[PDB]
Every structure is written in structure tokens, then in C-alpha cells.
Predict the structure of probable aromatic acid decarboxylase.
Amino acid sequence: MSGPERITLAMTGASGAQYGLRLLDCLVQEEREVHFLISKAAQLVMATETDVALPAKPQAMQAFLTEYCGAAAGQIRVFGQNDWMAPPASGSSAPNAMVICPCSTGTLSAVATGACNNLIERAADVALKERRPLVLVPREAPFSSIHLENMLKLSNLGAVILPAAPGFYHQPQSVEDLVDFVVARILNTLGIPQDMLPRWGEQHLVS
Amino acid sequence: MSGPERITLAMTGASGAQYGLRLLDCLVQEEREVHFLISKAAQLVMATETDVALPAKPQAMQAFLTEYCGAAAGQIRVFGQNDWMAPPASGSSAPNAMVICPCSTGTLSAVATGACNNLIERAADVALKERRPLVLVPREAPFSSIHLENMLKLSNLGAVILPAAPGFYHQPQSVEDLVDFVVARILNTLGIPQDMLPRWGEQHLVS
Amino acid sequence: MSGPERITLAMTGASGAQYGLRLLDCLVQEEREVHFLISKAAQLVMATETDVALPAKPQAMQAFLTEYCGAAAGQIRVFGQNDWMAPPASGSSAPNAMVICPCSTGTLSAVATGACNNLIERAADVALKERRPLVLVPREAPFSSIHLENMLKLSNLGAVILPAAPGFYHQPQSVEDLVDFVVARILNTLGIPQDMLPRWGEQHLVS
Amino acid sequence: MSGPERITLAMTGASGAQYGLRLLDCLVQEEREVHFLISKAAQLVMATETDVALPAKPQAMQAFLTEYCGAAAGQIRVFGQNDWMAPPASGSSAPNAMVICPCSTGTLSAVATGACNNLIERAADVALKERRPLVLVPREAPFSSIHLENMLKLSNLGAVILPAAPGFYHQPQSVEDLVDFVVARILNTLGIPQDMLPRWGEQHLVS
Amino acid sequence: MSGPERITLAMTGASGAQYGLRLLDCLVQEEREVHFLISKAAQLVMATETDVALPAKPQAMQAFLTEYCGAAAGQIRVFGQNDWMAPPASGSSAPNAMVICPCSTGTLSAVATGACNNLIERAADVALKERRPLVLVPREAPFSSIHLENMLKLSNLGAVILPAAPGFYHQPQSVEDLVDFVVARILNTLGIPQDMLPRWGEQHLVS
Amino acid sequence: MSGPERITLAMTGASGAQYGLRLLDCLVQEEREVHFLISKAAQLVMATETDVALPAKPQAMQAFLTEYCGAAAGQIRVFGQNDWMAPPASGSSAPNAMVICPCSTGTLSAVATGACNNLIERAADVALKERRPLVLVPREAPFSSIHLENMLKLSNLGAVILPAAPGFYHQPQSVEDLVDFVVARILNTLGIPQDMLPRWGEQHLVS
Amino acid sequence: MSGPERITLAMTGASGAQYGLRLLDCLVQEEREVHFLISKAAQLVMATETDVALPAKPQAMQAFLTEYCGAAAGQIRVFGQNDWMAPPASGSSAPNAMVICPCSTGTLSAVATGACNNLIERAADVALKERRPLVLVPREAPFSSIHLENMLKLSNLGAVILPAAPGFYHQPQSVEDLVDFVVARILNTLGIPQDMLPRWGEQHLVS
Amino acid sequence: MSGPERITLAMTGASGAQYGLRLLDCLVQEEREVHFLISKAAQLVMATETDVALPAKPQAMQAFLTEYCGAAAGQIRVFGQNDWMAPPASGSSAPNAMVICPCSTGTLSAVATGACNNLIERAADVALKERRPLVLVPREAPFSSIHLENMLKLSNLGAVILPAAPGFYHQPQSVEDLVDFVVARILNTLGIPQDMLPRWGEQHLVS
Ligand SMILES: Cc1cc2c(cc1C)N(C[C@H](O)[C@H](O)[C@H](O)COP(=O)(O)O)c1[nH]c(=O)[nH]c(=O)c1N2
Ligand SMILES: Cc1cc2c(cc1C)N(C[C@H](O)[C@H](O)[C@H](O)COP(=O)(O)O)c1[nH]c(=O)[nH]c(=O)c1N2
Ligand SMILES: Cc1cc2c(cc1C)N(C[C@H](O)[C@H](O)[C@H](O)COP(=O)(O)O)c1[nH]c(=O)[nH]c(=O)c1N2
Ligand SMILES: Cc1cc2c(cc1C)N(C[C@H](O)[C@H](O)[C@H](O)COP(=O)(O)O)c1[nH]c(=O)[nH]c(=O)c1N2
Ligand SMILES: Cc1cc2c(cc1C)N(C[C@H](O)[C@H](O)[C@H](O)COP(=O)(O)O)c1[nH]c(=O)[nH]c(=O)c1N2
Ligand SMILES: Cc1cc2c(cc1C)N(C[C@H](O)[C@H](O)[C@H](O)COP(=O)(O)O)c1[nH]c(=O)[nH]c(=O)c1N2
Ligand SMILES: Cc1cc2c(cc1C)N(C[C@H](O)[C@H](O)[C@H](O)COP(=O)(O)O)c1[nH]c(=O)[nH]c(=O)c1N2
Ligand SMILES: Cc1cc2c(cc1C)N(C[C@H](O)[C@H](O)[C@H](O)COP(=O)(O)O)c1[nH]c(=O)[nH]c(=O)c1N2
């Protein structure tokens, strides 16, 4: 396969739960192992913005997502917010790429300062110290100077700051076409195949 | 009225022509005077992403937009890319708020460095020196460190960096609901009434 | 009226509960709507430093403060520390000015880094991104370099850092005269009328 | 004794003359030698805010303060604003701790830039170059970014920035209880005994 | 005695519980008063890495450690994570030196930003503002740029960053010899006698 | 194979010769080519801390290490401190990963400033300019601000700063278990297989 | 005694050998233990500028200086430029204050960058990491921006930059009076008694 | 002639009046026009440190210095501290080199901040804006970080920071030989002939 075998997917409490669920579904279809983390505020966002009824405890959640995505047994792992025995908590774990989608401004702040107050924050801290891929998908507007400084610090270090800012150049016709644009970008960044967004200009020889 | 009487609306060559046209339409419905500027690359984007057939020369363009928006005669002014005799070129002009929507990374760069190579860039340079409102609506992903440094420099100065990153917390059902989210934010930032996006929590007394 | 119609008043766990209660009372007398937030540590400070017996749950608290201040029904709203459905949590809310009085060094840190770990921190993050008034009233001594850097970063962005450092130039005769000095400064900063602190030199024509 | 034998106490033209006089009295009661400096603006503040009738010339001033404090002959020395032959002017002097209480924003600026335009400013410049204790007690609100940058620069160098921001956690009952809080902090910082402010938690074993 | 009478010893959730317990034992043998704080994650680390069965509540914990160390009654105080009435919470407390051993990257971050979210973080914030000794003993590898910036900021302020990086120049023969190397360095830094690590070169006159 | 075929292993004069020798042995067992460099001070450290009798001249040294490690003929190359004709001296060489283990503070300084005064320093300078892997394993305590600034500068550029700070979370029972922890981290960072340190949480599915 | 029992005195190759020899003599008369280091260039300077015939090897040098100063046996220790077994090389040594007098611009550079290329440079690196007194006495003119940046970096960390810039305010009558001025300042900085330079203003009561 | 025809020589209140008087005498002997400025504190220093009885008012001072130096009529001009009609006050004046010898730390501060509070400070401000030579001769020890930052800022701009730190490499035999060393350096920097300090190595061909 091209791209990482394992992805840590963390969903935090920005608007855009749809982007996280669609990414999880795409990663499952590409036969990747997903270590799934979700914050308390992100549970509230998913309850507010979607009709997904996500169970709260990790084992129930894991069984639900496995069914939702049509995943294989053990393909999706779910770890709680204080589970320091989970792989993402330590850099001695097997290497994963990590994506925080959506990434709240609070989680962006914790990653930029190194707060490590829960497993999502520590997992990102570990990605940075081990030089493993870290993609943050903020959804906010305006972005204040506090947000922008945190994004710049992390981008300079090598994290990818990929805002949930879909393009329109393929004439999207639904909300799902816009969600898929951003998910396609995340997968492209990870090196994972995707067929939702064409390769710009691939057939253009000259003019 | 609340908010500015005159807005300079510049459209530059990022994806998201729909956001600029919808904003222009909203500003027209709120009886504002609009000084409309559009870059050459933005003309190509609007031809690519929309079915709007925008004439190229300023007088033809002005007549077309006036009809498209149902604007009053003289409500929309159109100025060419090198028209230094137009109001946005000088700080001795009557005060306007300015919005660049969509804002390409190239235009964001020119504003942050002060390049003033065309009327959009000079008009933003003038907004900054006169302390008049300047809102930039970038549409790009990932945002690189070059993009983020330019955004931070401008935000620290007092420009509003408002990415085209729509929220989902009112369960959008179409592309237009997502376009309207971002346009509502721009209007809110300008102080101009809008009824597309509710006031969060306005009826929530306690819990 | 002059000044904002709505103020978000957050009390956090620095010494000086008296300043927050007196400000709340003044804002009520000036017929303003107050969205009142209080941290867990600030509840302990108010229990320690005052004889105010503040109930813990938001509805009981709201009823108590309404009676304490002689407020109109619905004039004081109380929101809990994780209530993301409350107006201060989103920039799509109606605009309010925000004051954190007293502001602990921990809350000052969270605002400067963008931590957003509770509704007070997120509400300040939202004030900054929307360019709405934000006044922080720290009470600490010494101020360390960590405190001072956080204050400078926020002041450079446009927050007002208004320490609880009363002046003596009107020969104060009680603790309340010193509390009123600082509250008068906050109200002056907000643009809200106050008659506790005279306008310096207003009758001085020459010398 | 614990703490310094000699303190240079400079009073400059911020509000809060009471803090300087109370500190002088406490230092006298602790049998310390005080080198007392006072600016022209601080003389005006003491005339405005207190009923202390302080004579203007150094010898008359010295005799007055000696009587006011019940000091021993020669315990309080008074030096004029241009007296470069006084001990605080040179680092070849015997070592003293220095406190500027109250510290105006102008004096804070001079210390941070090294202006040395009078004996107070030079004495602080000398404390810094010799690594002798320097405590600044600003009284201002708001603190602007100019004030905060000057405070941060000096704090990073090792000066203590101790704002006149009294705490309330011992339920103060008078203006004097609040003045004594700040004076207690200064003495604590200097290492000089004081019995006005208890040692927090000293009898708390567990909970 | 040489060195401080009282030490605040905080253990946080980095690997290396052995260093904290050995330091506590050494400080007890040197007849020092210890104010002992431990984070929730550090309790899990001590359960994972050691055979010490540490009770969870502060009074039970205090009684256990008193027996483990052979301490005198009241020599070890234990305070909970939110106990703001404990001495380390306020700079008006009696002066202590503070050591965080081991220091997690999350606690290092909180100290560098001033987050004060629990008593360990606030106690370090207080050490810095009062200029009292603060020694951080991080255990992590690699150290990322986020870790290193937090360490540099604190070191520039005057905190000692003492990594758990034992030397081998006395030919250690057990894990305990390596634990004792680091503990000896901490005690040396505090000015507290220790006989585990010889004074390098003390008998070398020339060569 | 996974990871680099060739590693430049430089040992410099920090304590911890054991880490360098164990790493060399592991790299030999993984059939890697090693270009081995050692400073004069590191020779003294190895004589002081170990019972390894390392010959001083490069050919004798090469023959000794080949026997010590059970290496194949030509698998270990040894180059002298001024050998500019050796592969590590030029970026036109075949690509190698480089590790400095242990890394003295002096060598860390030379790499951060670009001093290139010997082949170890130049080889690191070359790794940086060619963007080849560079891992520094400092062993020092405390780390001063000079050390930390040099580490941050290099980490921001992309070098891995991996302190000799072993973890204890697998209950180490000997000095060798702690040496192996750090060596395992280096090999993990290089992408080279190792079976000394388990993959954290690899069998943990949920909780 | 007041001040340190042991001083590491390093002489490096700036002009002003007289200041180093006079300081060594004063420290001997004050019954201090001196660990004496001298660079190769400083030997040339002492041969050029003085009639002191200093033997080159450490034991001969030690015997010569002992006789020159009238020191007790073992009061002056001499260590060679690569003697890493000497006390100044390690922070596990007994604590000493360190003075580099004169300090060449090259040695100032090495200390500011952390080069540690000889025992003088490492000894200063160790003073900084252990927070032990470090006084640098540069003699150069002009001071370039490279010199000044190195001095500022070190001063901000807590080293004392004490240029060989004698004062004239006691009407010096010989070269020795000017040498003694600077030596008096060094001793004052160290806290060591000296009777060459009076305490400025000590008898001035008022004016 | 080589070097400038006109020099503005300002003496400010650092110790070292001898350097200023000797420089004035040398410039007179080299037939240069000198615009002489002296601060009030520098008058006190010259009264304290020398037997020069300098009259206070500019015309009397001018006549005295003309006689002291054996200058031609009009060769030395003297301007008062507030004389804005004097040539040094404006950059439209004829070009002069400027030297401040000695330069107090207060004058160094004013030049680095641009305070222009008297003619010496404004004259230096004018030298900088016109890119005319500016040489500052500070005499202070220690130099604090405030002094060093002011010196670095000015050196980076192109001012020469030439401390009064005489060399000894020509075996000086009197105070005057040391004064002449520094004066020779100033003249060398200005490009003005001097025969007090030989050209180092001028006759050394090889070795
Ligand atoms: C319905 C809804 C919608 C949003 C939010 C909340 C809720 C309930 N929050 C606020 C955010 O959740 C809050 O600051 C949390 O503290 C973030 O915590 P986590 O980073 O998820 O731990 C939020 N935060 C943000 O950065 N971007 C956003 O778009 C939104 N939108
Ligand atoms: C269809 C299409 C789509 C895009 C673009 C172009 C075209 C033709 N370009 C590139 C952009 O137009 C180019 O960098 C121009 O140089 C921008 O010039 P102006 O800032 O408009 O003068 C572009 N640029 C960007 O910053 N964000 C984007 O989303 C896009 N998308
Ligand atoms: C009685 C009392 C008095 C004080 C405090 C506490 C208590 C109980 N705390 C400490 C502060 O409450 C602690 O750092 C909290 O973590 C702050 O949390 P919040 O910012 O309120 O969420 C405190 N903090 C501070 O910054 N300034 C202060 O004056 C005080 N005084
Ligand atoms: C009655 C009164 C009250 C104040 C002041 C003045 C007077 C007369 N000033 C202004 C201050 O004195 C002025 O900026 C001086 O220039 C300060 O000079 P010194 O620093 O004392 O030399 C003043 N300055 C300040 O920094 N904080 C304050 O609280 C006050 N309050
Ligand atoms: C067994 C074990 C081992 C470690 C950890 C955890 C556990 C359970 N954690 C992670 C750390 O505990 C987590 O980031 C916490 O959030 C730290 O919180 P406190 O700083 O203790 O409040 C951890 N953190 C770190 O900085 N260095 C380390 O060596 C380790 N090792
Ligand atoms: C036995 C022994 C032990 C140590 C040292 C030396 C010796 C002989 N040195 C000092 C170091 O070797 C010295 O600063 C050298 O200048 C480093 O030179 P290289 O970087 O190897 O060229 C040393 N340096 C350091 O950074 N960390 C350490 O742990 C030690 N320990
Ligand atoms: C007679 C004589 C005089 C001086 C010098 C040399 C000699 C031989 N050198 C130059 C200095 O010695 C050279 O840069 C060395 O490299 C410094 O090395 P150390 O720092 O002593 O190891 C010199 N360097 C300096 O910084 N200030 C000075 O005053 C002098 N003067
Ligand atoms: C006898 C004597 C000696 C000195 C001083 C003074 C006196 C009277 N002063 C202090 C300096 O004069 C004071 O800070 C003035 O404010 C400087 O003002 P001018 O820069 O001359 O306007 C002083 N200042 C300094 O920077 N270096 C020094 O060597 C001395 N020495």
C-alpha cells in the first residue's frame, strides 16, 4: 500500500463532524487501521450537527463505528481520553500518521504549547517529538492572531495545517461534495489513494 | 443604518467565486454602495466555477452586475486594475470598509508586504494606513507557513482574517447554506444586518 | 445608552471577589444585560473573602444574583463552565463586551495561549477573534515574567489589561472607595456611565 | 538580622504615597538604614493624597522623616535628585536593596531604558549592573503595552515587578489593611521580617 | 543546615517514579520538611513502574509515605491537586524550594505558559513570581522543539532544567546507582548535603 | 532492509560511552555499514568509564572494533578527526544517517554554530545541508540555556535531539536495560529494527 | 569569611595580564583557594606585557605562582588546558566562583556559544549550567556587535560582564592604581573584602 | 588632511574626564575645528577628578579651553546644552564626526532611544540620521544588559562603541600612557593621524 498503515484519527469540538466521519469511512475503505479518539466537546458537536447516535463508552463506541463503516473486526480501535496505556500515548509505539479532524482552536492551542492534558493532546505531542505525520484540520472563522500564531508555530515545525476550507473548482453540487473535497486533501497529504478529487491538469500537455 | 455605507469588494483568484457574488448580492440588498474590483485570475475562476458570464471591461461589467443584483443605478461602481483615479486608490477618499472575498494567497502576500501592484493591493494598503476595516477571506488548503505568517502579520495590525471555512452547526442542506454561513460572518464582522445565520444562544437563559 | 448593551462578566479565582460583585451591581444599575460566568476556584474565593453565600448550580445562582443586585427578570443570565450552547461560546452570538474580573494568572495564561478549556476561556477567545472588547483585571503580586508576557501579548492584540491597582488621589476612606476606583475604571473603559470617580481636571482651565 | 541592612527607598510620582510612607515606617521599625529619595512629582502626590507636610530641602526632609518614623539619628539618609556623591549613584557603594514605591510609569520607563536622568534612575541602573535587589511597585491602570514591555524587560533581568494590587483573602477592613498587604509583600520579597500578613497555609498539614 | 528547610516535591506523570521516591527519602534523611504533591497520571506511573502501593487520598497517602521514609510526624505534608489553601498555592507562604521530579512534558508546558490548572502548576507559578528555587526534572526522549522552547523559556527565567540523564563516570553497577546520580544532582542544586556522588577532582592538585 | 544502509556513528566526550558501544553493536547485528568517528575526549571517557581498551590510531581501532562487535570485514570503517577525504566530510558522498552518541555539549555547540573544526563537526554540518538524518544524544545535567538554545535551533532545523534519558516503564533490572532503552529509541528514530523495547500498547484494542 | 572559598581564575589572551596577576595576589591574601587556568595565548601576553617569567608546565607553574604570591602549599592549584579530571570540568565538583580575567573576545565567544574546546571554556559552561558565579573581564576596543551580542547573551543569563575600564574618581596616580580599581570591582562582585577602593558616599548623610 | 576637518566632541558625566581633555588637545594639535559640548554632570566629574577649573558659561569656557589647548581663535567652539541654533542640532549643518568621550550610561541610553533631550543627545541623533561618524566611549563596570543592549543597537546601526579599556601591550608606565592608548584608538577610528600608539606588526614580514 501507499501511505501509512495506521492512522490516529482524533475528533475534537470544532464544527464539521461530517469531515471526521467521512475521513474515518474513507480510511476504513482503504484497509487502514484507525486509532480513534474523540473529545467530550466533539461528542456534543456530533450530537448537535449529525444524526449519528454515538455511544459514549469506548467499547460501545468501537462496536458502533465498526458497524457504521463496515470495518473489519479490530480495524478501528477506540481509546478513552485518559488512556495512557494506548499506543498514541508513547513514542515507543508503532508509527502512525495522526490527523485531528476537526481541530478546535483549543486543541490547536494545546498542541502548540505542549499541554498534553488528554490523550489527543499527548498523541500530537508524541507525533511531533517522533517526527511522525501530524495534520490539523481547524474549522473556525475569523482566525484570530492567537489561532494564527499557534498554526504558524506548528507549521514551521512540520505539522500540516489544513483548514476545512473546501474548493469549488470542480463545481460541487452538494454538502457532501464539499466535505469530500477536504477529506480528499487530507488523504492526499497522507499519501493514501482517493478518487473523489481529480489530479489537477493531469491531462493538460501544453497551451 | 448600522455598519458602513460603502464597501470596497475585491474578488481575487482563489476558488470560491460563489462567496464573492453572494456577498455582493447581500450588500446590494442592504442598500450599500459597492466599489467592485476583480482581478484577471478571478475572472478566470468565475468562468470556471460558475455559470456567470461576466463581461471583461469595467462599464460592461458594471451594467451586468447592476442587472444581476437588482441594484440601483450607481449603487455598484466598477474600477479597473490600474485605475489610480478611483476612490480606493487614495486615503483622501471617503471612508469605505474593504473585503477581499475570495482572497488568493498571492493577494494576501501583496497586502502583507505592501506591494501595491494593482488597485486591489493599493486599496488594501490604503485601508491599513487609514485604519479602515479590512477583511480578507482566504480559500486555500493546506495553509503553508508563508500563508500563515502573512495572515498573522495582518491580523496583528487589525485586519480580519476570515477563512472560507463554513460551520455546520445549523445543519446545512445545500452548497448555498455553506456559502451563506461565510457571507453571514463577513456581514457580522462589518456590522451589516443579515438574517442567514442566527445569533447563537440568544434565547438560552441559563442551564 | 452609551457603551455596550450586553456584558459578559466572568469571575475567576484571583483574590478580589469584591471587585466582581461591585461591577455586577453597577452594570445592573446601568440597565445592562449581563452574561455571568464564574469558575470553580472563584466560587471558593468568594466563600473565603466575602459573606456572599452563592449557590453552586446555574439556575439557583441566577436567582440569587438577581435578588442580590435588584436586577430585572432575565437581566442576569448565568451559564455553566461547559455550556457551549451559551452565547459567549460562539462568535455568531450577538456582540457583548467581556470583562474578566478578577482575572487569575491561570485564566490570563489560557487567554493568551488560546486554551479554551472552559466557557470563560472560550468566551475570551471568541472576543479576540471577533474584535469585541475584552478587559482583564488581574490581581497578583509580584507579576512574574510569565504573567507579564501573557499580558503584553494580549495588550498588543487589543485586550485591555487593567490591574486591580486602585489609585489614592481622591483620598479614599474605606475598602469600598478602593473597590469603586477600579470598578469606575472598568466602566470608563467600557464606555458605561459611572459617578464614583470624577473626571480628572474637568474644571481646570489653565495655570 | 535577616534581609538587607540598608535599603534605598525611592518614591516617585504614581498614586499611592501611603505605600511608600508605610514601608519607610516598617523598615525603620526593623532597624534598617534607609537611603530615601523622592521625586518632584512624588512630592506633589504626597501633598495631594496625604496630610503629611513634607519639607522640600533634603536636610529639613531628613529631620522631618526621622521624627515621623521615630527613627534613630542617621538611620534615614535623604539625598537630592542630582546628588551624584550619594551612595546610590555608584556601584562602588556599600550594597543596598532598592525599592521604588510607588513607581510611576515614567520611572519604570527610565529604568528599563537606562536613562539615568536623576539619582533615582541612576540608583536603579546601578542596582541592575551590580546585581543588587531591585523591587518596582507600579501603580497604574490600565497597564499599556509600553508599560508591560518595560516591566517584562526588567523582570527578565531579575528586577521584581510588584504592582500595588492588594489581596483580599484576609478580609481587609480598612484602607490601612490594604496598604499593609502590599507593604508586607515588599518586605517578604526583601527577606525582612513582617507580621502584617500571615504565612498562607502554614498550619495546614493535609486534606 | 545548608540549603532550604522546606521543599515542595511534586511528582508528575513522566516515567521515572524511582527518582521522585529516592529524592523524597533523601530529603527525609536530611531532616527537611517536604510538601508532597502528586498528579493523577503520576499515581498511574508509580503503580506501573514500581511495587509501591500508594494510597490515593491525601491523609492515607501522608501516613503511608511517613512510614515508607521513616519520617517524623508532620515532616511530610501531602496536599491534593485542588487544595488552594495549601502553602504552595500562595506566594505569601513561607519560602520553600520546589522540585518537579519527574516532570512530564505536560507539566513543563503548563509551567512555561503559566496555566496554573492544579496545585503543582500553581505552586511552580508561585515559585517563579517569588524568585524561589524551581528545579524541573524532565524525562522524555526525543525532546521536541515544543519541549525545548518551554525548557529554554524557563531556564532563561532562572528555573533549573535538570533532565533525568544520569552520568556513568563513576562506573554505576545497578539501576539504583543511576537513580542516585540524578538525585545527587538535584540535592547539589538545592544546596542539600549528599554523599552518593563524589566531588569531581576534589583531590586533584595539578598535572 | 528498513532504515539506512550506512550510519555515521560519532562518539564525543560526554559521559555514556556504554550507549555508543551498544549502539555500534546493534547496528553491526543489523548488517549495517558504520562509519565510526571518535573524539579525543571521548577516548578518555571510554578509558575512564569502561573496560574497553580502545587502540588510538584509526587502523588499529578499526581492527579492534571489528573483533569486539563480530563485524564483517569492512563493515566498520574508522576515520580520523582531520580526515577530509573520508565520506562524511562531503555532501557528494553516498547518503548515510548520522548519530552522535554520546553528544557532548561542546559538540552540540559546534553543530549548532557550524564550526566544522573536526570531522565529526563537519560530518554533522554536511548532514544538515544535505537534509540527511542527524540524531544527537546529549548527556548533561542541568541543561543550561546555552545548551537548550543550541538544541532548539537544531531541532527546528530537523535534527533529532534524543537525550540519554532512559524510561523505566518496562521495569528495568540492570544498567544494561537502561542503556538498551536509549539505544532502542535511536534505532526506532533511524527506522532500524530492534527487539529490546516493545511497541507500547500494540496489543491494547480498547478500554 | 564573606564570599566564596574557592575561585577558578582563568587568564586568557587579551591585553591586561596585570589585572589577572593582581587579582590572583589579592585572592591569595584573602586566604582563598584558587584553581588557576591560563591559555596558550595568555602565556604569550604575559611574556610580552610583564616581566613575569611564568613556567609553561602545570607543576612548575604552580610552584612559581605559589612563591610569587606568598601562597600556602596547595592554596593555588594549576590545571592544564585539557585536564578534564580537574574540578572545574564537571558540575559535580565542589562549588567555586569563576572569573576570566582578562577575557579575550575569543573566550567570550566560546562561552556564549558553549564551545567547551578547552578547560577554561568548559569550566565557564559548567558555571552557567550550575548557576555558579561567572565574571568575564573583557579588554578590547572597539567592541564590535559580535562582541556585544555575546556579552548581552551572557549577561541576560546572569554572568557579570565587567570590562577592564578603570574609573578615575579617586584620582589615580599610577598604572597600579588603575589596575587596582578593576581588581576591587571584581572582588566587590564576588563578595570578597578589599580595601583598595572606598565605599562611595559611605560618610555622606544628606545635602 | 586625512580624516574630518570638524569634530563634535561631547563630554558627559562618566568617569574619565582625562580622556576627553587629552582628545581635545590632540584634535587641536592636528588643526581640527572642534565643536565642544559638555553636560552638567560632566562639569562635576571634571571638578572632582582633575585640577582643571573649567568656567561654566559657554563664552568663558571657550576662552579657557582655547588657552588650555593652545588653540587658534575660533578653532574651538563651545555650545550650551539647549542651543538648538548651533551646527550639531541640525543635519543641514556642515558635516562633522562626533565623539562622546567619556559617554555616560545615561547618554548612551538617550542615543539608543532617540531622546534628544539636550544638544549632546540631539547631535548624536543627527549624526545617526545623516550617517555621519559617531564614536561613543563608555566608561562603566560592570556593563549591565541594559547598557549592552543600548550599545548593540547603536553598533548595529554603525556607531562605534569604543570602551575606555586601555591595552597594556606597549608596557605603559603612567596613567597618561593609558589615557593616550584610548585617545589613539579614537583618533585611529576617526582617520586622524596620531603618533602615541604604534602600528602593530608594521615591521613584521613573516615568521
Ligand atoms: C456545537 C459546537 C460547535 C462548536 C464548538 C462547540 C460546540 C458544542 N466549539 C467550542 C469548542 O468545542 C470548545 O472550545 C472546546 O473547549 C473544545 O474542546 P476540545 O478541543 O474538543 O477538547 C468550536 N470550537 C472551535 O474551535 N471551532 C468551532 O467551529 C466550534 N464550534
Ligand atoms: C480555477 C482556479 C482556481 C484557483 C486558482 C486559479 C484558478 C484559475 N488559484 C491561483 C491564483 O489565481 C493565482 O496564484 C493568481 O496569481 C492569483 O492572482 P490574484 O491574487 O487574483 O491577482 C488559487 N489561488 C489560491 O490562493 N487559492 C485557490 O483556491 C486557488 N484556486
Ligand atoms: C482564596 C484564594 C485566593 C487566591 C487563589 C485561590 C484561592 C482559593 N489563587 C489561585 C487560583 O484560584 C488558581 O491558580 C486557579 O487554578 C485559578 O483558576 P481559574 O482561573 O479561576 O479557573 C489566586 N490566583 C491568582 O492568580 N491571583 C490571586 O490573587 C489568587 N488568590
Ligand atoms: C496627584 C498625581 C497622581 C498621579 C500622577 C501625578 C500626580 C501629580 N502621575 C503622573 C506622574 O507623576 C508623571 O508622569 C511624572 O512625570 C512622574 O515623574 P517621576 O517618575 O516621579 O519623576 C501618575 N503616574 C503614574 O504612573 N501612575 C499614577 O498613579 C499617577 N498618578
Ligand atoms: C506509564 C506512563 C508513562 C509515561 C506517561 C504516562 C504513563 C501512564 N507519560 C504521559 C503523561 O503522564 C501524560 O502526558 C499526562 O497528561 C501528564 O500529566 P501530569 O503532568 O502528570 O499532570 C509520559 N509523559 C512524559 O512527559 N514523559 C514520560 O516519560 C511519560 N511516560
Ligand atoms: C570522564 C569525562 C566525563 C565527561 C566529560 C569529560 C570527561 C573526560 N565532559 C567534558 C567534555 O569531554 C569536554 O567539554 C570536551 O571538550 C568535549 O569534546 P568533544 O565534543 O568530545 O570534542 C562531559 N561533557 C559533557 O557535555 N557531558 C558529560 O557528561 C561530560 N562528562
Ligand atoms: C600580545 C597580545 C595582545 C592581544 C592579543 C594577543 C596577543 C599575543 N589578543 C588576541 C588573542 O590572544 C587571540 O584572539 C587568541 O586566539 C585568544 O585565545 P584565548 O581566548 O586566550 O584561548 C587580544 N585579544 C583580545 O580579545 N583582546 C586583546 O586585548 C588582545 N590583545
Ligand atoms: C564623579 C562622578 C562619577 C561618575 C558619575 C557621576 C559623577 C558626579 N556617573 C553618573 C552620571 O554622571 C549620571 O548618571 C548623569 O545622569 C549622567 O548625565 P549626563 O549623561 O552627563 O547628561 C557615572 N555615570 C557613568 O555612566 N559612568 C561613570 O563612570 C560615572 N561616574
In short: Residues 1-207 of chain D form a domain with the Rossmann fold fold (CATH 3.40.50.1950). Chain D has seven helices and six strands. The beta strands of chain D are 6-11, 33-38, 76-78, 97-103, 134-138, 160-161. Chain D has one domain: 1-207.
